[model samples]
Target: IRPTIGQQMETGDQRFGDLVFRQLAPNVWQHTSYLDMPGFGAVASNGLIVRDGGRVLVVDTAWTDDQTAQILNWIKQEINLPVALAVVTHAHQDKMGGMDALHAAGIATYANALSNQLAPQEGMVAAQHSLTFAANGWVEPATAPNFGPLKVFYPGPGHTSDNITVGIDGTDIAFGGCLIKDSKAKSLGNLGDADTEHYAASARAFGAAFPKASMIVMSHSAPDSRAAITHTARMADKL
Candidate 1:
C-alpha cells in the first residue's frame, strides 16, 4: 500500500530530550534531534522509522544511548510493533551514535564493513553486526537483500566511502542518508571523510538508479522532493 502524505505526526513528550518525530508518509516516520559540532554550531540530525506489517526497521539513531532508548520505547508503545532491525548508514555519530545502546537492548544492527571499521578508529562505537557485501559477491552498483519492504543499496561513495541508500519498495521513497542533502543547505554539509572529487558523480548515479523515487529523506533536514538529490549533486559539483 502506498503511504499518503498527511499531517505531520505530533508528540507531546516522548522523552528523549530534543528528539522529535514526524510523519513523512503513511507508515514512514522521521525522527530528528540536535547536535552541537565544533565548527557547525548546532545542527539537526535525522533518523527514520519504516513500518511493515507488524515489524519496524529503524535507520540511524540519535547521538546517545539515552536518546535511542527513548525512540525504542516510543515505537513499542505507539506503533505497537517490534523493531526487527536497524541499519547505520555510515560511521558518523549522527548516524550510528546510538548503536551501543541498541546492542544493549539486544536489537540486531548492521552496517558496512568500512563504517564498522572507521567508526572505532574515529573513537566512535561500532555496530554489533558488520558485513562486506563486496566480499560476498555484492559489489557496489546497487545490491541489497530485501527485508520486507526495505531494500538497501550502496550507491557508491559520496558523503563517505561506505554510504548507502534505502528504498521502501512500494512507497517510491528513498532514504539517502547523508549522501543526499536538504535543499536548504548551501554547500555539502560535512566533508571530513567525504570523497569530494566523486561526490557529485555518486549522487547522480544514485538518482538515476532510483528513478522511481519521488520523495528523498535526508539525514539532517526536512524530507524533500526528489529534487533534493539533484540539489545535492549540483552542490557537490560546485563545491
Candidate 2:
C-alpha cells in the first residue's frame, strides 16, 4: 500500500467513526476506536481489552484524557468490571498518555521495561512511575500492577525504545505497536521520538520470533498478514 496522509491531517478536528467494538476472544474486546487528536497528520491507534477468566485487561490507553475516559466508560457499561490490567504500548501519547485516567480508576498497569527506565531520564511521570501508574496515579491506585495473559516482549527497542508487542500464544494477533503500520512498509514519521536503529532491529526480531502469527495487528493501518509483516521487516532492514 502507498503512503497516504493520516485522517487526522485530512479531516482536521472533525471526529470520525462511532464507538464500534469487536471481541477478539471470549470477553476480549477491541473497543470503539476514538481519535484522541486530529488536524495534525497524526496516526490513529487502537486499544485492546482482554477478559482473562474473571479479570479485565486493557491494552494501551489513548492520546487524550477524554478518549481514555470514553473507552473506560464503555468498558464499565459493557462489563462493569474494574480494569484488572493496563498495558501501555509504547512511549507515544496516542498509546500511553491516557494512563492518568486509568491510574485514577484503581486499575493495575504494565509497560515495556525500557519505559520503566526511560521515563525517569526524560523527567516524565509515565516513564518514572509505570509501576505507580500500574498501581495508581496520584489519586488513582497506589501500587504497580502486573503483566497479563499475553507474552510481552520488549526486544531492546523499536518505533521507540519502549516499544513492545503483546503476543497471544497460538494466535494470529500480535499487537505490534507502531512498527508495522497500515501503509505496508511505508515509514511512519521519523522523529526524535525514539531510537530508530533499535526500532528496525526489533521489527526484525519480531518477524523471526513469531513467524506463525497469521495476523499481525498493527495499532495503525489494518491488521497485516504475516507476509506484510515480513515485507515490513525487509523494507525496514534497509532503513
Per-residue lDDT tens digits for candidate 1, residues 77-152, read 6687678888888988888888877887777887887888889887788877665655322334332333677667
Backbone clash tally (model 1): 0
Task: Choose the strongest candidate by TM-score.
Answer: 1
Highest lDDT against the true fold, candidate: 1
User: How does each model score on lDDT?
Assistant: 0.77, 0.61
Candidate 2 per-residue C-alpha lDDT over 79-151 given as tens digits, one digit per residue, 9 for 90 to 100: 6667777777776667776777887887766775557666545433363244322211111123333444566
Tell me the lDDT of model 2 at 149.
Answer: 56
RMSD of model 1 against the true structure: 4.5
> Backbone collision count in every prediction?
0, 6
RMSD of 2: 9.1
Stretches of candidate 1 exceeding 4 Å from the true structure:
1-16, 37-41, 134-146
